[PDB]
Amino acid sequence: MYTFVVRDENSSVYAEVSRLLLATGQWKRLRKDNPRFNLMLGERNRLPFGRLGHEPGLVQLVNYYRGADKLCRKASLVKLIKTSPELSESCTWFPESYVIYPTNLKTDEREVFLAAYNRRREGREGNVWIAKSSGEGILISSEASELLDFIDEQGQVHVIQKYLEKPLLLEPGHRKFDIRSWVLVDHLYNIYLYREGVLRTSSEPYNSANFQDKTCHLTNHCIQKEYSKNYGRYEEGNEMFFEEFNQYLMDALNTTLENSILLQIKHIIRSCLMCIEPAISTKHLHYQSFQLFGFDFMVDEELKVWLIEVNGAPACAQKLYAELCQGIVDVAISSVFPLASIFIKLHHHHHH
Amino acid sequence: MEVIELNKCTSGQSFEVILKPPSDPSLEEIQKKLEAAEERRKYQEAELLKHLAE
Amino acid sequence: MRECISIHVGQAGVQIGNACWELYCLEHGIQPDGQMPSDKTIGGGDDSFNTFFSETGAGKHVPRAVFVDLEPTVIDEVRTGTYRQLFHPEQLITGKEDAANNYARGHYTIGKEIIDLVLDRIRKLADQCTGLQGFLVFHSFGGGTGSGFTSLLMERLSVDYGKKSKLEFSIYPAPQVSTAVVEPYNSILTTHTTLEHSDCAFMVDNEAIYDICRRNLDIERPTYTNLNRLISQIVSSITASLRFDGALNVDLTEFQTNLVPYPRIHFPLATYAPVISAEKAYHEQLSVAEITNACFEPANQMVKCDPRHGKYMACCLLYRGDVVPKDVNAAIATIKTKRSIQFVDWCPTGFKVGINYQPPTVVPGGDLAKVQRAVCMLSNTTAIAEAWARLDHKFDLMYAKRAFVHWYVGEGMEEGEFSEAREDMAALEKDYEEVGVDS
Amino acid sequence: MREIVHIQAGQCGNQIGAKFWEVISDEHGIDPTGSYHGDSDLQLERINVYYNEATGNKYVPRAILVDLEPGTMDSVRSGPFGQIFRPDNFVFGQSGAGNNWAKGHYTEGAELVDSVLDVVRKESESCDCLQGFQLTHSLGGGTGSGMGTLLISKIREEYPDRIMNTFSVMPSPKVSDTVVEPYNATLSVHQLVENTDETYCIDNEALYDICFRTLKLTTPTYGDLNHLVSATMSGVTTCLRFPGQLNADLRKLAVNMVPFPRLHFFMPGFAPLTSRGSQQYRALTVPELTQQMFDSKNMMAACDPRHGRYLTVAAIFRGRMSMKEVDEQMLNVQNKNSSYFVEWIPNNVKTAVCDIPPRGLKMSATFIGNSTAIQELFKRISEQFTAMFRRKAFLHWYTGEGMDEMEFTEAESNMNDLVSEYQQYQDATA
Numbered sequence A: 001m002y003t004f005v006v007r008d009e010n011s012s013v014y015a016e017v018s019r020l021l022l023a024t025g026q027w028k029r030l031r032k033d034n035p036r037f038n039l040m041l042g043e044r045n046r047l048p049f050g051r052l053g054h055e056p057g058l059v060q061l062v063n064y065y066r067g068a069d070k071l072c073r074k075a076s077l078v079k080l081i082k083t084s085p086e087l088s089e090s091c092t093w094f095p096e097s098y099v100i101y102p103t104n105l106k107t108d109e110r111e112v113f114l115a116a117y118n119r120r121r122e123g124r125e126g127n128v129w130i131a132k133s134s135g136e137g138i139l140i141s142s143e144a145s146e147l148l149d150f151i152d153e154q155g156q157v158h159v160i161q162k163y164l165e166k167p168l169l170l171e172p173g174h175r176k177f178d179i180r181s182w183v184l185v186d187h188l189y190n191i192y193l194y195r196e197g198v199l200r201t202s203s204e205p206y207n208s209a210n211f212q213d214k215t216c217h218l219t220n221h222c223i224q225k226e227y228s229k230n231y232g233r234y235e236e237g238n239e240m241f242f243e244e245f246n247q248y249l250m251d252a253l254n255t256t257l258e259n260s261i262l263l264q265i266k267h268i269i270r271s272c273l274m275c276i277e278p279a280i281s282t283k284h285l286h287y288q289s290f291q292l293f294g295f296d297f298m299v300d301e302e303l304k305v306w307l308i309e310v311n312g313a314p315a316c317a318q319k320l321y322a323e324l325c326q327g328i329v330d331v332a333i334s335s336v337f338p339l340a341s342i343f344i345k346l347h348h349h350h351h352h
Numbered sequence B: 001m002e003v004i005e006l007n008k009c010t011s012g013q014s015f016e017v018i019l020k021p022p023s024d025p026s027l028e029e030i031q032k033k034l035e036a037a038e039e040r041r042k043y044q045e046a047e048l049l050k051h052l053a054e
Numbered sequence C: 001m002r003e004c005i006s007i008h009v010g011q012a013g014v015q016i017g018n019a020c021w022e023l024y025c026l027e028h029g030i031q032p033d034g035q036m037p038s039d040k041t042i043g044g045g046d047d048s049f050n051t052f053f054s055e056t057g058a059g060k061h062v063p064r065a066v067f068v069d070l071e072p073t074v075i076d077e078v079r080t081g082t083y084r085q086l087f088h089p090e091q092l093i094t095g096k097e098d099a100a101n102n103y104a105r106g107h108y109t110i111g112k113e114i115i116d117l118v119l120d121r122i123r124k125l126a127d128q129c130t131g132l133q134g135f136l137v138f139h140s141f142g143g144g145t146g147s148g149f150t151s152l153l154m155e156r157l158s159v160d161y162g163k164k165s166k167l168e169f170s171i172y173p174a175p176q177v178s179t180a181v182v183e184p185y186n187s188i189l190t191t192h193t194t195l196e197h198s199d200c201a202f203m204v205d206n207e208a209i210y211d212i213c214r215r216n217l218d219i220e221r222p223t224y225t226n227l228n229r230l231i232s233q234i235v236s237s238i239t240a241s242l243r244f245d246g247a248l249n250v251d252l253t254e255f256q257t258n259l260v261p262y263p264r265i266h267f268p269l270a271t272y273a274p275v276i277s278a279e280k281a282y283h284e285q286l287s288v289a290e291i292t293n294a295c296f297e298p299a300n301q302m303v304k305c306d307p308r309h310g311k312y313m314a315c316c317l318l319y320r321g322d323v324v325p326k327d328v329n330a331a332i333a334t335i336k337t338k339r340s341i342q343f344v345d346w347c348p349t350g351f352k353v354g355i356n357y358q359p360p361t362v363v364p365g366g367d368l369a370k371v372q373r374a375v376c377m378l379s380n381t382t383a384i385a386e387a388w389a390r391l392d393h394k395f396d397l398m399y400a401k402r403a404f405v406h407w408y409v410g411e412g413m414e415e416g417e418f419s420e421a422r423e424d425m426a427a428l429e430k431d432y433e434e435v436g437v438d439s
Numbered sequence D: 001m002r003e004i005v006h007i008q009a010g011q012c013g014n015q016i017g018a019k020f021w022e023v024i025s026d027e028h029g030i031d032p033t034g035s036y037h038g039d040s041d042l043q044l045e046r047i048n049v050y051y052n053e054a055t056g057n058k059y060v061p062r063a064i065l066v067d068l069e070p071g072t073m074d075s076v077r078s079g080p081f082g083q084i085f086r087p088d089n090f091v092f093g094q095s096g097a098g099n100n101w102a103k104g105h106y107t108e109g110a111e112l113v114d115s116v117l118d119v120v121r122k123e124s125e126s127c128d129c130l131q132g133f134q135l136t137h138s139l140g141g142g143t144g145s146g147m148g149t150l151l152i153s154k155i156r157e158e159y160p161d162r163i164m165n166t167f168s169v170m171p172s173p174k175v176s177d178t179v180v181e182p183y184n185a186t187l188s189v190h191q192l193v194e195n196t197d198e199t200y201c202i203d204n205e206a207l208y209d210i211c212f213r214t215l216k217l218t219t220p221t222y223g224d225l226n227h228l229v230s231a232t233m234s235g236v237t238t239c240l241r242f243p244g245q246l247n248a249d250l251r252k253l254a255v256n257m258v259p260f261p262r263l264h265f266f267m268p269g270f271a272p273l274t275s276r277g278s279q280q281y282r283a284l285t286v287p288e289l290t291q292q293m294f295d296s297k298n299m300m301a302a303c304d305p306r307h308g309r310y311l312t313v314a315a316i317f318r319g320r321m322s323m324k325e326v327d328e329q330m331l332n333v334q335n336k337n338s339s340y341f342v343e344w345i346p347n348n349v350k351t352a353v354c355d356i357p358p359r360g361l362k363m364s365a366t367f368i369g370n371s372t373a374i375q376e377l378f379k380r381i382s383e384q385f386t387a388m389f390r391r392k393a394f395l396h397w398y399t400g401e402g403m404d405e406m407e408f409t410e411a412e413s414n415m416n417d418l419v420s421e422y423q424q425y426q427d428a429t430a
């Protein structure tokens, strides 16, 4: 009888994982404060990694990677991408991004932000930007001082990123979307991409000359279920799965999903994770980590994939919950704790 | 990465390597603390011996 | 030359002292009977080994040591042991009844009746010192003697020798070998009352030493003898610069200056490599790069924590063996490009290196193999706060029900000293997290 | 922290105590003449804890034998090891106490107690460092119950800072001399709650069931019961009597076992369970010792450990075995049944090992549990009490000796309080 505890009641994914675990017949749930557990399904904030791995005769495993927030906070992600050599300033798949603290504090990149901004004013180029924090407080504008206004209007650090102004739009609809990929990193730092991703769609024709109405500009399931009139017309949940998107690419663009998008997604995923690997690896540690991540992508009209953010505590789409969670137990939990594939392993060693 | 203040001797050597520059109570208060706890002890013991006398 | 006095308090302190002093003798070529052929200054002198040994007219080299137990079994086995003749009777001080794993019994009840005798026997050694530096104090956090009497001792050492430096070698409580359920209580009480009296403390978590003995010495269930011979190896690399010619950490003030820029945050993590089984028939000897790299694996630390999720304020590398500066810098250059080593913004990123050419000495018939080169890294990282978090949690768990409290209160302690101590610890955890983590 | 002073009071106290000295005299290689013929000085290194050294280098048990009647103590002087005992330490009146707590505590016993305390004082005055006292008695009769607790009170008066330890046998209608036993026991439990540091609750109920259900003895005697009792006593005193890692004494046991001063009623457990004379020869493996010693069928107090929670657990393993395997199994019970150990006392199960096994076995394990399920025992005693006290039945035997119904009501109340505190911690959660 392996033993586990549950310190995130709000978690869709690991609620399901806990249910499947109990139904193994060989896993017992203990009380939240019992130290004598094999597996911690832990909280999101202030998870006490300092206390794990000090129970003699207990191999301990946790469902989060200490240090992973560097990837899953937008400010940290911008800092990590511009500071880590393996990612670079010279990085083809991240939007040009600057971190801007509010007025109150008065290191911040504001004066370096407007320097590139003005050469986009100088160059006749598209210079619409996004500002966001880590449908809340999103503002898209081509006037810098508009946002620099807005960002200090709110007292938290934000990032100004380039807005991808010619995105790929599904017809019928002439409408936006983002792609959500689910990645599982196990205790060995195997990187497992889940075969099923989802396209969070917009149901509203994209419109280039009115940036403030944001139901045609933000593909978030919440905003979609609220202010959008056409919620559910083309897709059931404003969600299109991979069979259909692949077929539509085949029919309308003559490519496939793997060639046009999924190669780039796999390259971005394994670069971002192989980067932070030495800072988070629990290879020789006294406790062990896996973690489920949600990577979020945008495809522009050229079939180029841009990473926009990494999500550290992601919810799954309702159709996939079973499969993915079974997978999480199979390769994240059962590998460490044996009883009595739906993933692609991301691995590559080009010689040079 | 600079190697500075290097000293050598028959038994060894020492040096510094820099990779990047930088971005009480009294004797009598104590005897009072101890004696306060000793009298707390003696009070508790006398309460015990009182209850046993009853 | 400036003498240091070693004080060993309680079981853990005394037995670890045995381990160290045995090791020191072997290193300086001092035999069990006190004679040192190598010393041509019969009668005395001011060589650097004299920081730890004084001399008699017959050529005896006597440790500048005091052993203090509230009960006789352990110090009796010193009084009758292999180094029977090494020490002066007057330096082995024994009670009759011990502290029963009770901080308050060792501090208040039994401490009061023996503090003066110990201080007089200590001053008899200080009166033999032309320039005394201060004290190295060996004890456990969990014992009743080791926690309570040590802290009373530390207060009075501050008042009787206020200008001298005080260093702790402290054994942090591990349930695998732990004797007592109340060791978290004792640990907190004594950390609180000793914090401002200690200039630099080296924590040894018995759990780390135990697993090092299992994993790297192939020892199925380590004894205190295995634990203590490994601990004394570490202690000897930490003290070798006070006992040997050199120019790094040559006096106790330099330990604080090099490792402790914030007086409260004075707990430097010690990593040590290589620990090699003496029964291992074939061993490829490790390189300067390999052992310097081993200094950044948690499995080699005296306390297991994760320095990657903290920041550094100082780092010293002490090498004993065949090492030259060139290879150290090559190794550091390599390591810095593969590892998370973030200092605090207001401290230089860098290493202070000391090298003694004599390789580590291992006790004949011990568990450790001889090696051609070894290193002990002393790093003041905020990650060690993890250990405090552990202890405090256990304390919080018991104290919420006031479990066992009555044993303390019945020795004359007051429930309030518990929460005072716990709030000092809360302060300490907060200091660490501010220094080492960002918003 | 060396010498212990042993007192055995009344019929049961003296029969179980005599067995104790037989067993441990055999373990320490000391013969009925008090001479020593053993082969390991592991047998003599802490022999002073329980024996004084006398001329001829003979060893005399630091034992005081008390009764209000001469019957059983005569039979002790007659029995196998009787002549090992120092004769002055036989202190007995001729009254008898009639299974009556009042005669033991207030009338008959008061006449004899000062003589007992004289022999106690003379045994302690010789002690290099006395750690305290251990008493053997039952709580169902009158001498051991009534006088035994009188003695404990007077000893706490004279030696308030020494550990008081008892082996106290609780009564059961399954093994029952008289109907007034629940009265005597309630009256003593009160005393024990205020006046001892550590009490081993040896339930005569549990001893009968072990004998009957597990050892297959159809008609158990007090001899079959006392075999189990003397095995448990050997086991719980091993740490005191032999050299070890732990260097064990009564005070550290108290400090680590008793988180709350009134909750010091320990549930003992032995493995393997053994009939007298039965030579059984199969090696017991360490997983077997652990599972059995924690089995409720191996407990000497008739409580269900799964109806409560362990506040603390102390264990001793005896014999040549793998301390790695021992640590493995002890961890395995804690980790596999973590529900049954309080989470607000971290690492509350402590374990010791001794090379020397007891006579007859190659391997054995003794268990001391401070469990909240012990309340079940006191509840049982309470019901049997109220059943009678509701009608003031048999009360005259006590009021005739000076006692008031109020005293009974006080004692009933304090026991029901004890039960409530145990339940408090059985529901407390960190």
Ligand SMILES: Nc1nc2c(ncn2[C@@H]2O[C@H](COP(=O)(O)OP(=O)(O)OP(=O)(O)O)[C@@H](O)[C@H]2O)c(=O)[nH]1
Residues within 6 Å of the ligand: C009, C010, C011, C012, C013, C015, C016, C070, C098, C099, C100, C101, C102, C106, C140, C142, C143, C144, C145, C146, C147, C171, C172, C173, C174, C177, C178, C179, C180, C183, C206, C224, C227, C228, C231
């Ligand atoms: N490393 C090491 N730890 C020890 C040694 N002896 C005891 N300990 C640890 O110290 C704690 C108990 O402290 P002790 O030194 O035995 O207690 P003490 O100072 O003698 O105090 P009292 O005996 O209670 O009067 C436990 O965590 C033991 O594991 C030892 O020789 N080496």
Ligand SMILES: Nc1ncnc2c1ncn2[C@@H]1O[C@H](COP(=O)(O)OP(=O)(O)CP(=O)(O)O)[C@@H](O)[C@H]1O
Residues within 6 Å of the ligand: A095, A130, A132, A135, A161, A162, A163, A164, A165, A177, A178, A217, A218, A219, A220, A296, A298, A308, A309, A311
């Ligand atoms: N540089 C950019 N260019 C174009 N569109 C962008 C963009 N950045 C974000 N978006 C769009 O805005 C939406 C919300 O942005 P954001 O990445 O901040 O999601 P979020 O953090 O609020 C919730 P989740 O964790 O589920 O993604 C994205 O899905 C995308 O449609």
Ligand SMILES: Nc1nc2c(ncn2[C@@H]2O[C@H](COP(=O)(O)OP(=O)(O)O)[C@@H](O)[C@H]2O)c(=O)[nH]1
Residues within 6 Å of the ligand: D009, D010, D011, D012, D013, D015, D016, D097, D098, D099, D100, D138, D139, D140, D141, D142, D143, D144, D145, D169, D170, D171, D172, D175, D176, D177, D181, D204, D207, D222, D223, D225, D226, D229
């Ligand atoms: N286990 C055990 N119980 C006993 C023994 N003798 C008496 N009892 C129990 O002790 C109680 C009577 O106490 P007893 O010692 O005979 O009376 P006392 O001499 O006046 O203290 C009853 O509950 C008996 O069942 C014995 O040798 N072994």
Ligand SMILES: COc1cc(OC)c(/C=C2/C(=O)Nc3ccccc32)c(OC)c1
Residues within 6 Å of the ligand: C179, C180, C181, D235, D236, D237, D239, D240, D246, D247, D248, D249, D250, D252, D253, D256, D257, D313, D314, D315, D316, D350, D351, D352, D366, D367, D368
């Ligand atoms: C199980 O039988 C026993 C087991 C014991 O330690 C395991 C002890 C002595 C103990 C001791 O000396 N310190 C302790 C701390 C916790 C638990 C028990 C002790 C003991 O003393 C009578 C009896």
Ligand SMILES: [Ca+2]
Residues within 6 Å of the ligand: C039, C040, C041, C042, C043, C044, C045, C046, C047, C055
């Ligand atoms: Ca000399």
Ligand SMILES: [Ca+2]
Residues within 6 Å of the ligand: B024, C158, C162, C196, C197, C198
């Ligand atoms: Ca000072």
Ligand SMILES: [Ca+2]
Residues within 6 Å of the ligand: D111
């Ligand atoms: Ca009379």
Ligand SMILES: [Mg+2]
Residues within 6 Å of the ligand: C010, C011, C069, C071, C098, C143, C145
């Ligand atoms: Mg001790």
Ligand SMILES: [Mg+2]
Residues within 6 Å of the ligand: D011, D141, D177
């Ligand atoms: Mg009878």
Ligand SMILES: [Mg+2]
Residues within 6 Å of the ligand: D114, D115
């Ligand atoms: Mg008299």
